[model samples]
Target: YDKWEMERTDITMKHKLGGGQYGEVYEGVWKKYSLTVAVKTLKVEEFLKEAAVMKEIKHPNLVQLLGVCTREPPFYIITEFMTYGNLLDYLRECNRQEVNAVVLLYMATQISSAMEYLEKKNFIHRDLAARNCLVGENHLVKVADFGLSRLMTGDTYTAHAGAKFPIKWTAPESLAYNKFSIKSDVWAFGVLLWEIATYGMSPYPGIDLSQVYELLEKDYRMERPEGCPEKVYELMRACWQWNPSDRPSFAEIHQAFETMFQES
Candidate 1:
């Protein structure tokens, strides 16, 4: 879309990157641009929506879309290649003690800044988590995965029944009423912070998916991750507030990180 179309001959697929329920991503080189890129291949129908949404977004902390190959079936969505790969794997592969609080805060700050931009643009990143974020050179984190995102014309988007969701990372309200907003994204961000603090440990460990609904209803929150600072945990808690309105906006979240950086 928007003249960001690519020809199939222009790309050379190097290797598989990663994938999920919808599609697989590959590391490729764009011959025309002479740039290494990530090429996501999915059904044409599935890709068009993502491509349309991605074209409207432009941010340093958000995965940059280079172009798309929609001329044939199994469309290709080209984006910048992040060398270090997804944050979840990157964190898991590193020594837990090697990543300092400053680095953690920096990564969180970048994500929040990108989400802040999306919020202003009235876009809801229905799925926001460490797994959906890519780490590039300099340990820079950029928010990825627009497959579950949508530009909201209203305050929220009501999910149709049977729509798939990430149970652990989703907000309580979103799970209950199929309602999603920027605030719900905040909830996922809180879980993402937990993941980073724990060096990619799974959230709600020992709790079954069926148990989450009732547990959250009783105000059961995940315990503070080991080695997580008090202030950072406090921010995570704020994001998990039961009432969506009680959550801080991404702008506020970014400012909190800024304050922490200044103090450090």
Candidate 2:
């Protein structure tokens, strides 16, 4: 509430938060409420699909969209500003075994819970990665960036002319044939697990994008990073199976992590 109206009228630049494939995020106070918020401004030429999806999704593990300011050429998305930033940065700063294990479990639980919610709502979050996850003050993980989300029940998937792709977290199906579904999201989640465990190392790091496609087509798959538990590794491997049906459902994933947390 640091006089957002005054800032809107007078201030030129707010504190930089981060940037994504689609936009840049800034820390700013909204007008009237005096509430500190994360303001996301979409690239001038990019369409705001994620903003549209964020507007309707309501979940504890999902970032809350306060409102949108679409007054002119540049559109802004306002949401709760997460102080800890993305999960990748968190993993990078805390590389201890105990801390990483606890963090990964918490991250997996929240993300699976969010996926369950989206699945029940018949939506598919095509892009799921560490960078898209925000950590709150209490260490809770909140999923963001839904620009690639699509209606799961629909007959056909809509494609944007310049849709950005994150090859690292992309499922085999998505990379091979542009196929996306809840199961595909699960595959991406597996890569997300690898990302968190490895402190944000790029998935399939040495390979090029085309190689990913060829590898997946040839039954080549990702290996769990060092330091990940065998059980977690197994689950990650299972999720990336060539057959989507072989991938665990979000509910199954939640149960698996619940057991892992309790037994490990």
Candidate 3:
């Protein structure tokens, strides 16, 4: 533990990255690699689960795990540092510019492609928000924060029956009884689409979580915002279908964006 612990005199903390209920991230240099890395120091339980998820995922769009130092008190999982920061921040700035339809479609393509890749591995990224996507210097987007991610094996894959959910992005079925699946992720993708188009507006704008619950209880849903292109709006609503099975696969979403990009 002593060897892995950052000696206050030895290692310098360059930047404090974002954190959440599960872990805290830090930007630092790994002396051995002579490279910058995002170090996610997780609490014991989250560290264990993250380790399991890291061992399973291997994709370019997903943040690559460099190594984990379990010998330390707060275990550190090191990963590649994304230079352009997060998608949420990027989208906010994008709204200030003359963002083209192609650019938005490309962003969606990158995220959905990442989602498709993860789904293939049978892992569910339960927290697939825009903030979790990091932009690379080359403008490629990499999905980060696997703390809520988990493997869906056999019967354990069934969605939680009564879990409180992220109201803004959840599909009607998922919001109703935690009916998550690859299709449910598609529902998330639609909300993600809205997020990208609106330049980071919270989903169901002007509505609180309680309002969302009431609307969902009455089978009411916030429709796609008016300024979005018709094709994009259609896709968003398609993913928000009340029945999970009606939602498109990530592949389909990617293809739709591809066609939309070509058409525009």
Candidate 4:
């Protein structure tokens, strides 16, 4: 909150971007810095956690937190403006042919790279999905939305009662034991791969949330998405392993993509 702090008067809102329960986002300009930025306005009391965490992390594939504006009613978390918005919405609106296997692989690779960085930092992104990632110029994918992320002092985090969790993308162990770890994030990353392969189709299309737990308990996993390459599907299967220890690390996943890219 020292040098990272921004003056409220310097920002001018261009338009409303999007929002959720916690805050509203806006496309804005910082006159002082002469930069276009995304302004995420959340209550001051609820802003410190994310601001503190974001300030410490810096990565190409992760959205950059440029500054903060806490002088007013709605505090702001300033970040680089992403032109294309969230990956899920971007994929849904674009033609499937426009985004080929190579492009999809590149996007996945970028996310894996970011996750590897977070893993090394001992951070856990509890919600890892296409919807939580942003698309920038040149179709660059940047992982965003750290609302459900946390820095881990240990191997895992135990959830308190009433914590929100995404059921479809959650690992079986996380759902059953209220525990989250980097391995659990790997599970969500697999689901994100499916989302990209299917061009934003919902996971477990016909299955009800109530039945998902039972289904996974019996070893039932999602089938390969249509048109997804065999190798990519194999990686997805590896991520869904019932045992967390059996899943590949982000570094391993990124290396796999590199190999595939080189071979092709």
Among all candidates shown, the one with the greatest lDDT: 4
What lDDT does each candidate get?
A: 0.84, 0.73, 0.70, 0.85
Q: Please rank every candidate by lDDT, starting with the best.
A: 4, 1, 2, 3
Q: How accurate is candidate 4 locally (lDDT)?
A: 0.85
- List all candidate RMSDs to the true structure: 5.2, 6.6, 6.3, 5.1
Cα lDDT, model 1, residue 141:
92
Q: List pairs with backbone clashes in candidate 4.
A: none
Cα lDDT of candidate 1 equals 0.84
Q: Among these predicted structures, which one has the highest TM-score?
A: 4
Stretches off by above 4 angstroms in model 4 are 19-22, 32-34, 43-45, 146-161
The residue-by-residue lDDT of candidate 2 on 16-48, one tens digit each, is: 654342246677776566667877766543446
TM-score, predicted candidate 1 vs. hidden true structure: 0.88
Candidate 1's displacement at residue 18, Å, is 4.2
Candidate 2 stretches greater than 4 Å from native: 1-13, 19-24, 30-34, 42-52, 70-75, 95-98, 146-163
**Which model, 1 or 4, shows the larger lDDT?**
4
Q: Give RMSD (Å) of candidate 1 vs. truth.
A: 5.2
Candidate 3 C-alpha lDDT tens digits along 72-124: 56667677888878888788876454456677777788888888888777777
> In model 1, what are the clashing residue pairs, if there are any?
none
Task: Estimate, for each residue in 198-262, the C-alpha lDDT of model 1 and write its tens digit.
Answer: 88998898887778878988999998988899999999999999999999999999999988888
Better of 2 and 3 by TM-score: 3
Model 4 TM-score on a 0 to 1 scale: 0.90
Q: What is the lDDT for 113 in model 3?
A: 80
State the lDDT at 97 in candidate 2. Answer: 63
